[PDB]
């Protein structure tokens, strides 16, 4: 009667997937076989005799990431029929992940999620998980989103996409993939969150005093954000902010639905010994201009509407005190046509930490999702990264060679330019 | 006899009214299992005002839990005194009005308004002659301010001559949640002024001022926060359920507090309120209680009384106390604060005495005041409103559900007219 | 009845009330736990003068202990008998005005003054008609001399017709702490001379001079100096609460000691003050105690009265006495020491015999003498001011925070006309 269907498409979509489900499994107390030794009904079903199957679907046209979890440790945790392994990769092509080999796999995906949707009536939304800088994570995610808009047109879609970073790239045609994707992403996503990779990297530096890890805590840090956002659905709370209100509470216009995110505290055992973690400073560190997961300096950006989920032993009274000091301090500018812009949702359950992980046990934590006009500078350096690649038609030869028509890139550039001028007229 | 039917709506309302039944049941002598202990005829001679006999010897409250989020009354069931309500008075919600006045009033405002009106009639005509309708709700939430307000409309169009009142909380000046506050408040205040006999105003952080300064509390809770609003909620009707030297009625207050039919907003206080450093050395006498109704720090509402003049004030005393320095204590506070009172009404203050003190105490009083201090809150939500219309934001997801631009404009043509008739009377 | 509302300003004021309230509570037979013991009618016959009933049988002092640093009344509360006061009468400052007149009076203390004004009229208006206000403070520090005279200044306007009883501890000549002594002292005294009806001058080393030379105290602390002045407050207000052969009150002192309104600064002696080696050797009678009263060695103002003429004199006799010898024993001190009295007032005297002494003693005296001996103290705080002021001393804080050069010049004009008037009457 109350659930959310999660879709994880793309190579980074699977890796952010199994980090989220390893966190949710130990959070619910359920096991990698499915059974414990009514909060589970928002992310899992019943598999008959007391077992539980996740409400997920994994999608990737290239098989070595799908069979990796089919052979790994969560073999019989997942139902083995939504682990939709394809045949061959899209190879950093939006065009190949949307036109050539997508049509033979979205028939299997929409038929599976049709059965996933009808297991309970009262579905709340979708959890898209993809990387937009690549080919099959962006292309097949866009193809699957378009079918979701025309079939389930009244349901929210919560996109969690890994937007490419200003420096850390590890591809070439990210300006070609991200500019082409974000037009059809704009009118088909109800609510979306940006995640630039190197923003997690620098907060791993200053907050976690680790020099260089691998992708495993790239994904565990994000998975704690997903856990805290949907903990209002899952666990009982003092003031619950569900998805069906969070969609309609932060989004001021039908087109500005791209938001940043931050999480505090992300603190190791090095310095959990040294400072108290109370709301009067966790909110300050969450609003600290180098702590978000997008690397979008909001000092020249301009805040519009913010969402805070306090999880743990949190009273609303020191929440009100801590948000009042945010309002009174000058370094955070809220827009002149929105004086109050704040959410205070309270959950009783403190956040859980993965065993053997780099996080530390904290009493309380705030999850931030905020809409700001700062994000115009994120998409404007995509404009500068793309306009001189397209200036004399680099890499377009095989984008059109599969059967795509020249000139749709330029009207997509009209859509990005329409998005930049929209962000300017919002802040003015 | 005469029975008040209680409607309880919103997440804020279902926690406020739960503490209301937690404080009325244990002062009337009813255990959470429904039985009675207390061996007093004063607690039993009028128990039908709020309760009903179940032919099993227990009392089921005449309360209607109503909400579109299914977790709020889930916590009511799990909480203490959570086995009093009949499950048949419960009406649930699954789609949820998500902090949204528009979808809570029309879209899911239809398939539940037929059932919550079914449950209110067979709690209404099942008695001999009912009296009134108390409604606890919020003007900050979506389903507490939209879905409960459609209930206000449907109750009156069936029952046009009975009294009814709303113990409604309001959006916050200083620290505000549920960011469409003026949208939820002002689209509801039109229906409050044309379709409600009394509306009593509660501010959340004015209650924070109660626990900070007059209570010396470090970290209080919603249990206490709703407890000090349920003390005055008890006090407005305890003189109905109990005898007294000068008894009183909700309609007794209504006739001689509301001057003119469109202004009926009230300023609710409660005395005494003590700390560990305010209980031992403090005299509990009526001249000591005189200053606590007329204390801005002892006020449950954000409106500063010193920035206005009281049109008509009233007090509901309780306890073993002489009725006269009710009234010369109300006479000298009128004479010293003559500039704090309106001049064209002689003897503004109303007095009434109930002969049952609050349980565990010796004396208390519940203050109700029609005052021109209330426009402070009515103008900050007014110009918080006007900042959300000169650039059209946050309401396109109201127009998508039917709430087009027509009704928003006269929601302000009646709101600034409401405060203009307020200021033209001073 | 007649009631005294006590206000303590500064660290000196809170400590001097942390000894006066003890010596007046055991005089009333009150335990630290507020319960009376002593089975006497006379102790409870006037207890409403300095205490208020708490509807529990326990009496709370009508004091307001107040300054800008929390360490002073935390040590009062932790100390014995300091529990008697309300935390409501305690008002807290956290930043603190440090030895600064200007920011005590204008910027910092005015932030706190609107809340301590609330608690002073509650102790004032709570009775039918007050006798007066007793404010004890010192003229050396910042919060007790700057904002201490701010509350002296403002209680003049809402309560003009009632008496203004003040104790002030003036700066010390030879060894003074708190380097800016005359800037605090002279800038306070002008507000202290047109807003206070009578002021008593207590000096610090004159309290020491009584300790070393007449009490023979080997070890006096601040508590030993504090007893000497606590006996002075106890004697001057004894006849209000306790009967006698001849009544006396604060206005009784005021109309007989002030002939001209600009001069109300009083000398205080206290008798008997025995060295305990000779306590068992000293006879106790009126003709031996009167010359202990009229004595420079028993002066808690450090001015030799032999360098001046007594303008007016009075003596609050106390104890089981003979009220003939109440008065020819001061007839003797007038017709022998003829030059030590003014000439154009014949019969300079007032005896005021009060029947009940302090406990154990059969005789006691506080002495109030309006004399031109205080000329030496006002001149000395004047040239210590002007030697500093001629070279712009310690002043850029005072000017930078809400004052200017002009205000200090009339501070010395109404300091200098006090000396010029006392030479007119010399």
């Amino acid at each position: 009667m109350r659930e959310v269907i999660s879709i994880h498409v793309g190579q980074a979509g699977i890796q952010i997937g199994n980090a989220c489900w390893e966190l949710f499994c130990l959070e619910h107390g359920i096991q990698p076989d499915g059974q414990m030794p009514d909060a589970f009904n928002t992310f899992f079903s019943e598999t008959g005799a007391g077992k539980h199957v996740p409400r997920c679907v994994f999608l990737d046209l290239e098989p070595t990431v799908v069979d990796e979890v089919r052979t790994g440790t969560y073999r019989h945790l997942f139902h083995p029929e939504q682990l939709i392994s394809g045949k061959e990769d899209a190879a950093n092509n939006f065009a190949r992940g949307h036109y050539t080999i997508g049509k033979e796999i979205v028939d299997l995906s929409l038929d599976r999620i049709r059965k996933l949707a009808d297991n309970c009536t009262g579905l709340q939304g979708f959890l898209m998980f993809n990387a937009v800088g690549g080919g099959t994570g962006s292309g097949l995610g866009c193809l699957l989103l378009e079918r979701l808009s025309v079939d389930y047109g009244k349901k929210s879609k919560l996109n969690f996409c890994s937007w490419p970073s200003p420096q850390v790239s590890t591809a070439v045609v990210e300006p070609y993939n991200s500019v082409l994707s974000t037009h059809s992403l704009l009118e088909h996503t109800d609510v979306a969150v940006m995640l630039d990779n190197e923003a997690i990297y620098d907060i791993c530096r200053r907050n976690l005093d680790i020099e260089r890890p691998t992708y495993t805590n790239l994904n565990r840090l994000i998975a704690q954000v997903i856990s805290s956002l949907t903990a209002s659905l899952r666990f009982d709370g003092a003031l619950n902010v569900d998805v069906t209100e969070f969609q309609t509470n932060l989004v001021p216009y039908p087109r500005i639905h791209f938001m940043l995110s931050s999480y505090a505290p992300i603190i190791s055992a090095e310095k959990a010994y040294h400072e108290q973690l109370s709301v009067a400073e966790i909110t300050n560190s969450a609003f600290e201009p180098a702590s978000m997961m997008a690397k979008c300096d909001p000092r020249h950006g301009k805040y519009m509407a913010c969402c805070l989920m306090y999880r743990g032993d949190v009273v609303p009274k020191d929440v009100n005190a801590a948000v009042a000091t945010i309002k009174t301090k000058r370094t955070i500018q809220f827009v002149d046509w929105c004086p109050t812009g704040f959410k205070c949702g309270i959950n009783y359950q403190p956040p859980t930490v993965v065993p053997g992980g780099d996080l530390a046990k904290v009493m309380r934590a705030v999850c931030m999702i905020s809409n700001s006009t700062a994000i115009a500078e994120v998409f404007s350096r995509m404009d500068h990264k793309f306009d001189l690649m397209y200036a004399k038609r680099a890499f377009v030869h095989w984008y059109v060679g599969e059967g795509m028509e020249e000139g749709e890139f330029s009207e997509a550039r009209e859509d990005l330019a329409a998005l930049e001028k929209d962000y300017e007229e919002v802040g003015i | 006899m005469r029975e008040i039917v209680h409607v309880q709506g919103g997440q804020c309302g279902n926690q406020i009214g739960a503490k209301f039944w937690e404080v009325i049941s244990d002062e009337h002598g009813i255990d959470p299992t429904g039985t009675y202990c207390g061996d007093s005829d004063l607690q039993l001679e009028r128990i039908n005002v709020f309760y009903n006999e179940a032919t099993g010897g227990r009392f089921v409250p005449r309360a209607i839990l109503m909400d579109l989020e299914p977790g709020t009354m889930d916590s009511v069931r799990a909480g203490p005194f959570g086995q009093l309500f009949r499950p048949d008075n419960f009406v649930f919600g699954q789609t949820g009005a998500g902090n949204n006045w528009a979808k809570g009033h029309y879209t899911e405002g239809a398939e539940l308004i037929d059932s919550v009106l079914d449950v209110v009639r067979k709690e209404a005509e099942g008695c001999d002659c009912l009296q009134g309708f108390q409604i606890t709700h919020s003007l900050g939430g979506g389903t507490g301010s939209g879905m409960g307000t459609l209930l206000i409309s449907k109750v009156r169009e069936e029952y046009p001559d009975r009294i009814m009142e709303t113990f409604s909380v309001f959006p916050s000046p200083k620290v505000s949640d549920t960011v469409v506050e003026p949208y939820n408040a002002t689209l509801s205040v039109h229906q409050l002024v044309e379709n409600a006999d009394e509306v009593q105003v509660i501010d959340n952080e004015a209650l924070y001022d109660i626990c900070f300064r007059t209570l010396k509390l470090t970290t209080p809770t919603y249990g206490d926060l709703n407890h000090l609003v349920s003390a005055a909620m008890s006090g407005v009707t305890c003189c109905l359920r109990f005898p007294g030297q000068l008894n009183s009625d909700l309609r007794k207050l209504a006739v001689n507090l509301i001057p003119f039919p469109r202004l009926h907003f009230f300023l609710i206080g409660f005395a005494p309120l003590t700390s560990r450093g305010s209980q031992q050395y403090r005299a509990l006498s009526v001249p000591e209680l005189t200053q606590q109704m007329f204390d801005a720090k002892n006020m449950m509402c954000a409106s500063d009384p010193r920035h206005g003049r009281y049109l008509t004030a009233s007090a509901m005393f309780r306890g073993r106390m002489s009725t006269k320095e009710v009234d010369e204590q109300m006479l000298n506070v009128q004479n010293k604060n003559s500039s704090y009172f309106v001049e064209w009404i002689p003897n503004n203050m109303k007095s009434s005495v109930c002969d049952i003190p609050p349980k565990g105490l010796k004396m208390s009083v519940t203050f109700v005041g029609n005052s021109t201090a209330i426009q402070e809150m009515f103008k900050r939500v007014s110009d918080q409103f006007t900042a959300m219309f000169r650039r059209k934001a946050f309401l396109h997801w109201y127009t998508g559900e039917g709430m087009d631009e027509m009704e928003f404009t006269e929601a302000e043509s009646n709101m600034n007219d409401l405060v203009s008739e307020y200021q033209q009377y001073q | 009845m007649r009631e005294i509302v006590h206000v303590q300003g500064g660290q000196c004021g809170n400590q001097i009330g942390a000894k006066f309230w003890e010596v007046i509570s055991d005089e009333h037979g009150i335990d630290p736990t507020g319960t009376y013991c002593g089975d006497s009618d006379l102790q409870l016959e006037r207890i409403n003068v300095f205490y208020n009933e708490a509807t529990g049988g326990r009496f709370v002092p009508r004091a307001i202990l107040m300054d800008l640093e929390p360490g002073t009344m935390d040590s009062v509360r932790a100390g014995p008998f300091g529990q008697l006061f309300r935390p409501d009468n305690f008002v807290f400052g956290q930043t603190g005005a440090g030895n600064n007149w200007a920011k005590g009076h204008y910027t910092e203390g005015a932030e706190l003054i609107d809340s301590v004004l609330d608690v002073v009229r509650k102790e004032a208006e709570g009775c039918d008609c007050l006798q007066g206000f007793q404010i004890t403070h010192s003229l050396g520090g910042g919060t007790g001399s700057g904002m201490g005279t701010l509350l002296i200044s403002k209680v003049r306007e809402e309560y003009p017709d009632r008496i203004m009883e003040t104790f002030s501890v003036f700066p010390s000549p030879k060894v003074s702490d708190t380097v800016v002594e005359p800037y605090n002292a002279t800038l306070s005294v002008h507000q202290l001379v047109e807003n206070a009806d009578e002021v008593q001058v207590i000096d610090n080393e004159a309290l020491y001079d009584i300790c070393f030379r007449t009490l023979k105290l080997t070890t006096p602390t601040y508590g030993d100096l504090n007893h000497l002045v606590s006996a002075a407050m106890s004697g001057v207000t004894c006849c209000l609460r306790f009967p006698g052969q001849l009544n006396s009150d604060l206005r009784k002192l005021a109309v007989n000691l002030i002939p001209f309104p600009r001069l109300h600064f009083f000398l205080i002696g206290f008798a008997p003050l025995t060295s305990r080696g000779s306590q068992q050797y000293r006879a106790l009678s009126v003709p031996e105690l009167t010359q202990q009263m009229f004595d420079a060695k028993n002066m808690m103002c450090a001015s030799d009265p032999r360098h001046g003429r007594y303008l007016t004199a009075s003596a609050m006799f106390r104890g089981r006495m003979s009220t003939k010898e109440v008065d020819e024993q001061m007839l003797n001190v007038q017709n022998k020491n003829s030059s030590y009295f003014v000439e154009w007032i014949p019969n300079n005297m007032k005896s005021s015999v009060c029947d009940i002494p302090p406990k154990g003693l059969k005789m006691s005296v506080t002495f109030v003498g309006n004399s031109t001996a205080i000329q030496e103290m006002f001149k000395r705080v004047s040239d210590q001011f002007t030697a500093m002021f001629r070279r712009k001393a310690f002043l850029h804080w005072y000017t930078g925070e809400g004052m200017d050069e002009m205000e200090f010049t009339e501070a010395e004009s109404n300091m200098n006309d006090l000396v010029s008037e006392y030479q007119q009457y010399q």
């Binding site: 009982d236 609303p316 009783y348 | 509390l217 | -």
Partner: peptide, 25 residues
């Protein structure tokens, strides 16, 4: 359901619930 946000710091009467100096003698 972990009613900590309703955990009473008050009692039946309204109020609330229950939670150096070297003196110079």
């Amino acid at each position: 359901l972990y009613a900590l946000r309703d955990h009473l710091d008050s009692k039946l009467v309204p109020n609330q619930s229950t939670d150096h100096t070297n003196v110079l003698s």
